[PDB]
């Protein structure tokens, strides 16, 4: 019986030394096994595997605690889905554009590139160590693990078309937004006024207007009575806000926003670009960078810096 030593892991933090039989498959010895994202379940050990780290499914109480503490999920499919995405994302290119890590276009990844660019510019702390650790690598120019984790957390596969807003709402569930707070007042000429308070993810995201200034002054929404009412922002406590609406032609003014999602196409099929406000306006389209003093284009998300806002409307 010939053997080598390898490490198995669910997290790549806690390594578990294993003596492996070179006459059995990894699958026979460990269950589903991954080597740098590749499924080696049905492969027999090779001498070059000595001292390498293999991922395995949590098949005992030790591994399940380690996996839960790292990923903050008990979904047994998660590790498998992360490894299948990572097997493709480790082959993408991560261009440095304007001091930011982007992604060269591939497998409809424009929505992921736009989310990655946005996450480098808004103030957000991820709760799971997996996302904290992979985000740090993405900043250092190696975003493959971060992109594969986003796909696993959102239950999306490489190649699937995606929406930036939907992606940010899933990721924001894993971010520490617990103390974010939004107070709204809605004024109806029939029904009167209604003040509500939102906490967490709901406190930082709004669907129906791109303009943070217009949200502060009043937006028109349908009341339950069938009239139009006026909704406005009374108080905001958060490090950023995300304002979204169905794609429409919109003017981004230098200095008035952090970054924005441009979307061209239709609900089914389309392309995201990323607009950021530095000393001038930059349009990041994967690896491609164009700059202008002005922008007009089909915008669907705008991100704004915030700390504490209280309306002066009495
Ligand atoms: C920006 C876009 C979108 C957002 C909101 C309203 C829209 C109205 C008309 C056309 C596009 C619209 N996403 C990508 C479409 C989209 C939403 N969820 C998805 C899931 C998978 C693929 C695309 C999508
Ligand atoms: Cl973080
Ligand atoms: Zn009403």
Q: Which of 114, 267, 272 has most ligand 1 atoms within 8 Å of CB, for mutation?
A: 267
Catalytically active residues, by annotation: 110, 271, 285
User: What is the C-alpha to C-alpha distance for residues 300 and 111, in angstroms, rounded to an integer?
Assistant: 12
* CA-closest residue to ligand 1 atom 8: 246
* CA-closest residue to ligand 1 atom 11: 267
Nearest ligand for residue 136 CA: 2
> 123 is written with which tokens?
């103030």
> 240 is written with which tokens?
């950023």
Q: Could you give the C-alpha distances from 159 to 85, 162, 170, 186, 311, in angstroms and in order?
A: 10, 9, 19, 41, 44
The answer to whether 284 touches 276, Cβ cutoff 8 Å, is yes
Say yes or no: CB of residue 162 within 6 Å of ligand 1: yes
User: What is the C-alpha to C-alpha distance for residues 201 and 95, in angstroms, rounded to an integer?
Assistant: 30
Q: Buried (b) or exposed (e) across 216-229, using 16+ Cβ within 10 A?
A: bebbeeebeeeeeb
Strand 38-39 and strand 33-35: pairing?
A: antiparallel
Say yes or no: CB of residue 262 within 6 Å of ligand 1: no
> 72 is written with which tokens?
């903050």
Q: Count Cα neighbours of 141 within 13 Å in the Cβ-side half-sphere.
A: 6
> 164 is written with which tokens?
């930036």
Of the candidates 146, 201, 194, 207, the one whose C-alpha atom is nearest the C-alpha of residue 176 is 201
The answer to whether 285 touches 276, Cβ cutoff 8 Å, is no
Percent helix, strand, coil in the chain, to 5, is: 25, 35, 40
Ligand 1 centroid to residue 39 C-alpha, Å: 33
Ligand 2 centroid to residue 257 C-alpha, Å: 22
Atom of ligand 1 nearest to the CA of 161: 22
Ligand 3 centroid to residue 12 C-alpha, Å: 55
Ligand 3 centroid to residue 205 C-alpha, Å: 24
Nearest ligand for residue 111 CA: 1
Cα-atom radius of gyration of the chain, to the nearest Å? 23
Of the candidates 161, 174, 307, the one whose C-alpha atom is nearest the C-alpha of residue 240 is 307
Atom of ligand 1 nearest to the CA of 244: 5
Residue with tokens 């097997």: 87
Q: What is the largest distance, in Å, between two alpha-carbon atoms of the chain?
A: 84
Say yes or no: CB of residue 277 within 6 Å of ligand 1: no
User: What is the C-alpha to C-alpha distance for residues 269 and 292, in angstroms, rounded to an integer?
Assistant: 27
Method used to solve the structure: X-ray
Q: Which residues contact 46 (CB under 8 A, 6 or more apart)?
A: none
């Amino acid at each position: 019986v010939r053997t080598i030593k390898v490490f198995t892991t669910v997290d790549n933090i806690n390594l578990h030394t294993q003596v492996v039989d070179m006459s059995m498959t990894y699958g026979q010895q460990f269950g589903p096994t991954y080597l740098d994202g590749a499924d080696v379940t049905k492969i027999k050990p090779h001498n070059s595997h000595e001292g390498k780290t293999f991922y395995v499914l949590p098949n005992d109480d030790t591994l399940r605690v380690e996996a839960f503490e790292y990923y903050h999920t008990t979904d047994p499919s998660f590790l498998g889905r992360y490894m299948s995405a990572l097997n493709h994302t480790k082959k993408w290119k991560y261009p440095q554009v304007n001091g930011l890590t982007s992604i060269k276009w591939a497998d409809n990844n424009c929505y992921l590139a736009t989310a990655l660019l946005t996450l480098q510019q808004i103030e957000l702390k991820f709760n799971p160590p997996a996302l904290q650790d992979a985000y740090y690598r993405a900043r250092a120019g190696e975003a493959a693990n971060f992109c594969a984790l986003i796909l696993a957390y959102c239950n999306k596969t490489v190649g699937e078309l995606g929406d930036v807003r939907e992606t940010m709402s899933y990721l924001f569930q894993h971010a520490n937004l617990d103390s974010c707070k939004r107070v709204l007042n809605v004024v109806c000429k029939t029904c009167g006024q209604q003040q509500t308070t939102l906490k967490g993810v709901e406190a930082v995201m709004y669907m129906g207007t791109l303009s943070y200034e217009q949200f502060k002054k009043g937006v028109q929404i349908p009341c339950t009575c069938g009239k139009q009412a006026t909704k406005y922002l009374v108080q905001q406590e958060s490090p950023f806000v995300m304002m979204s609406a169905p794609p429409a032609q919109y003017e981004l003014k230098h200095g008035t926003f952090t970054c924005a999602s441009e979307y061209t196409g239709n609900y089914q099929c389309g392309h995201y670009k990323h607009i950021t406000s530095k000393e001038t306006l930059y349009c990041i389209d994967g690896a491609l960078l164009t700059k202008s003093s002005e922008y007009k284009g089909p915008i669907t998300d705008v991100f704004y810096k915030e700390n504490s806002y209280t309306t002066t409307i009495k």
